[PDB]
Amino acid sequence: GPVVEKIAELGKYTVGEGPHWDHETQTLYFVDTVEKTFHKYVPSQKKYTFCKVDKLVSFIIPLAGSPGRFVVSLEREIAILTWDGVSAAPTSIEAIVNVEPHIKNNRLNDGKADPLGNLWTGTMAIDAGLPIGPVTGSLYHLGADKKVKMHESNIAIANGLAWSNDLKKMYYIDSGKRRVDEYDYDASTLSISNQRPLFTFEKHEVPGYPDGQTIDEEGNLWVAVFQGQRIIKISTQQPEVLLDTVKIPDPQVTSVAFGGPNLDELYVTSAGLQLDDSSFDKSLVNGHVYRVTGLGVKGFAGVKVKL
Ligand SMILES: [Hg+2]
Ligand SMILES: [Hg+2]
Numbered sequence: 515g516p517v518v519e520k521i522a523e524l525g526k527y528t529v530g531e532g533p534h535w536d537h538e539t540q541t542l543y544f545v546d547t548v549e550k551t552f553h554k555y556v557p558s559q560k561k562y563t564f565c566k567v568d569k570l571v572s573f574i575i576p577l578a579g580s581p582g583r584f585v586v587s588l589e590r591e592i593a594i595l596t597w598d599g600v601s602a603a604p605t606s607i608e609a610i611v612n613v614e615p616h617i618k619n620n621r622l623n624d625g626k627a628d629p630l631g632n633l634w635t636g637t638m639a640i641d642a643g644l645p646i647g648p649v650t651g652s653l654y655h656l657g658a659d660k661k662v663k664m665h666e667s668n669i670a671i672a673n674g675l676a677w678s679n680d681l682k683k684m685y686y687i688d689s690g691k692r693r694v695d696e697y698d699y700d701a702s703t704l705s706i707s708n709q710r711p712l713f714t715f716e717k718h719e720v721p722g723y724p725d726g727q728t729i730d731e732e733g734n735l736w737v738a739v740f741q742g743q744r745i746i747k748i749s750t751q752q753p754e755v756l757l758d759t760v761k762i763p764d765p766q767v768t769s770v771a772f773g774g775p776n777l778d779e780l781y782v783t784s785a786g787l788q789l790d791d792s793s794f795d796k797s798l799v800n801g802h803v804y805r806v807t808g809l810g811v812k813g814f815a816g817v818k819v820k821l
């Protein structure tokens with residue numbers, strides 16, 4: 515079976531999240547969605563750094579054409595951070611847009627660029643809760659003239675995103691729905707339609723909640739299972755097909771990104787935050803970062819945001 519390695523060099527995270535693999539610099543970036551920190555890991559050189567801000571963060575993606583600059587979330591603001599990748603604070607912050615200026619207790623959560631470079635991201639109540647809590651989030655993309663467009667409402671916990679290689683489908687996760695949805699994606703108008711369930715956890719006895727996700731070159735989705743101690747591999751060719759399961763020692767698996775020189779090493783983030791209604795005792799909940807090899811598939815380099 516696959517080899518799951520705990521990356522000792524990286525330590526433990528409250529809620530490690532938002533992994534992004536920059537292929538040209540062979541560097542993984544990620545966030546902690548509770549501790550207000552960004553993180554950098556260069557595996558070939560065993561280099562780790564962090565960056566502190568005073569707002570809640572949920573993604574970090576290099577800005578296309580601008581070395582040393584990243585598109586990030588700061589509470590409800592999408593912003594450009596100028597960061598040298600090693601100092602413990604940004605050099606400067608350039609706000610782009612506040613997606614929800616008048617929803618004082620919302621935050622941005624998972625975000626990713628589509629293959630064309632357009633940032634997609636969604637919101638949630640800061641005090642969202644599972645299985646039931648306030649449902650206040652929406653799904654957006656950032657388009658022309660730095661204005662967002664809304665694509666879906668009634669989202670409890672806005673989470674993982676992926677697109678098919680032919681640019682005809684988008685895949686999206688609201689953790690509260692305990693399923694992955696597929697949509698027809700119109701790359702020319704940047705709109706989605708014909709929402710329908712692709713994979714429903716209760717139909718397959720999968721515990722926990724879908725969180726982050728990514729897609730491989732064959733079109734398989736790799737889905738993080740929060741409170742499931744696993745990642746799952748699911749089909750995009752047929753609905754409701756579980757292809758494989760890979761157990762991850764940390765119960766609170768949060769997200770996934772392919773990396774390594776050949777894009778065949780799956781980085782997996784997790785959360786050490788101990789929750790009062792957990793299916794797992796506290797001794798099990800640590801928050802390490804893992805690397806999975808031997809899956810027999812390759813992914814894609816992380817896409818930079820175009821502004
Ligand atoms: Hg930073
Ligand atoms: Hg940054």
Ligand SMILES: [Mg+2]
Nearest residue numbers: 624673725726
């Ligand atoms: Mg997430």
